[PDB]
Write an enzyme that holds these catalytic residues in place. Structure first.
Site, PDB file in Angstrom:
ATOM      1  N   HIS A 261       7.117   3.180  -8.227  1.00 38.49           N
ATOM      2  CA  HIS A 261       6.193   2.728  -7.204  1.00 38.49           C
ATOM      3  C   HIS A 261       5.048   3.656  -6.814  1.00 38.49           C
ATOM      4  O   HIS A 261       5.265   4.665  -6.133  1.00 38.49           O
ATOM      5  CB  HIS A 261       6.957   2.437  -5.953  1.00 38.49           C
ATOM      6  CG  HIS A 261       6.426   1.272  -5.237  1.00 38.49           C
ATOM      7  ND1 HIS A 261       6.524  -0.026  -5.690  1.00 38.49           N
ATOM      8  CD2 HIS A 261       5.767   1.219  -4.081  1.00 38.49           C
ATOM      9  CE1 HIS A 261       5.926  -0.831  -4.829  1.00 38.49           C
ATOM     10  NE2 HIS A 261       5.471  -0.097  -3.831  1.00 38.49           N
TER      11      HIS A 261
ATOM     12  N   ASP B  14       0.832   1.852   0.985  1.00 37.32           N
ATOM     13  CA  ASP B  14       1.962   1.518   0.109  1.00 37.32           C
ATOM     14  C   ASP B  14       1.969  -0.018  -0.075  1.00 37.32           C
ATOM     15  O   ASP B  14       1.905  -0.743   0.917  1.00 37.32           O
ATOM     16  CB  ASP B  14       3.281   1.991   0.719  1.00 37.32           C
ATOM     17  CG  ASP B  14       4.433   1.931  -0.266  1.00 37.32           C
ATOM     18  OD1 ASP B  14       4.400   1.068  -1.168  1.00 37.32           O
ATOM     19  OD2 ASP B  14       5.370   2.747  -0.137  1.00 37.32           O
TER      20      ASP B  14
ATOM     21  N   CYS C  31       1.580  -2.449  -8.315  1.00 31.91           N
ATOM     22  CA  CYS C  31       1.419  -1.516  -7.215  1.00 31.91           C
ATOM     23  C   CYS C  31       0.288  -0.529  -7.464  1.00 31.91           C
ATOM     24  O   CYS C  31      -0.379  -0.098  -6.507  1.00 31.91           O
ATOM     25  CB  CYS C  31       2.759  -0.815  -6.951  1.00 31.91           C
ATOM     26  SG  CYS C  31       3.403   0.455  -8.023  1.00 31.91           S
TER      27      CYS C  31
END
Lengths: 239, 75
Positions: free
Chosen positions: A116, A133, A183
């Protein structure tokens, strides 16, 4: 899935953003900016800029990014005001060498996994450090990680004289869903929205429908890699 | 002579070369020591991309010149 997931293509995006917004510095993909060397290299990098403000031909050589030349890194240092850092978290891990040996071949397995990308943007013009995030809470809680960056923020205030730096949560509304490997692409999309407007709110830029949101992102990814398809070399840009 | 090839991971790699080994020769031995062939990486020295084709002698890669190696890291 999406071709804004490889470190090389995230670097090409960082170059694309320095071409469209000249105040941003590109990223260095050569030191592991995982949670272990997370805030050390931010303090390091922002210091070797303030050491760039005074005439300096020595510290630039050692704290240089490998893909860059230290004269060019000093010129890009002296003229940049926005500094992005992409951090790689895994919630199954808590030591640099194992998070790293894990990478050392996670590159030769080449499958991605539970990875991630996260983003911090350090902007010395606002004295602000935004955190983003794609899954909001997936690397730490939103008000411990915030301390961590309120901790980094006061260290930055000390080497950059005008008071500590401001902290803004970039991630308020959850924008990713399950089994999506986009991501890096959302980190890119947040950086483009940020560089156009640092006081944007992402909740008005994201559709409240989920499938409309994914369709927007895939349109962005296609537009982006069309703009990037002629970036060949990896070196830091000349101009 | 020895040279070194520090990478995206820090696991600095100790590799003995010669002044005119090539870039795919060096990439032939990092596939003989970690298993990743000469198309999957890109060597970098002094901010300059090492062209697959050339050889140490062209770039002044003397004894121990820290070299560097970009992988393809998916996240």
């Amino acid at each position: 899935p999406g071709r804004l997931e490889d470190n090389e293509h995230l670097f090409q995006f960082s170059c694309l953003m320095q071409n469209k917004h000249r105040r941003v510095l590109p990223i260095d993909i050569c030191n592991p900016l995982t949670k272990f060397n997370f805030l050390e290299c931010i303090c390091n990098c922002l210091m070797t800029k303030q050491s760039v403000n005074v005439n300096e031909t020595d510290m630039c050589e050692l704290f240089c990014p490998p893909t860059c030349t230290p004269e060019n890194y000093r010129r890009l240092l002296c003229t940049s005001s926005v500094f992005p850092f992409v951090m790689w978290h895994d919630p199954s891990a808590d030591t640099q060498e194992a998070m790293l040996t894990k990478m050392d071949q996670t590159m030769s397995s080449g499958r991605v996994g539970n990875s991630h990308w996260v983003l911090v943007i350090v902007d010395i013009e606002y004295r602000c450090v935004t955190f983003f995030d794609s899954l909001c809470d997936y690397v730490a809680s939103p008000q411990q990680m915030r301390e961590q960056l309120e901790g980094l923020a006061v260290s930055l205030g000390a080497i950059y004289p005008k008071s500590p730096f401001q902290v803004r949560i970039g991630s308020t509304v959850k924008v990713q869903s399950p089994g999506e490997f986009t991501c890096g692409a959302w980190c890119c999309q947040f950086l483009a929205w940020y560089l156009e407007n640092p006081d944007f709110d992402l909740e008005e830029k994201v559709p409240t429908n989920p499938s409309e949101r994914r369709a927007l992102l895939a349109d962005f990814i296609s537009t982006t890699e069309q703009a990037m398809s002629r970036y060949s070399s990896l070196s830091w840009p000349t101009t | 002579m020895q040279i070194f090839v520090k990478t995206l991971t820090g696991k600095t790699i100790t590799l003995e070369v010669e002044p005119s080994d090539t870039i795919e020769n060096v990439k032939a031995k990092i596939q003989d020591k970690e298993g990743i062939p000469p198309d999957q990486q890109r060597l970098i020295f002094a901010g300059k991309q090492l062209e697959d084709g050339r050889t140490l002698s062209d770039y002044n890669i003397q004894k121990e010149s820290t070299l560097h190696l970009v992988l393809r890291l998916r996240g």
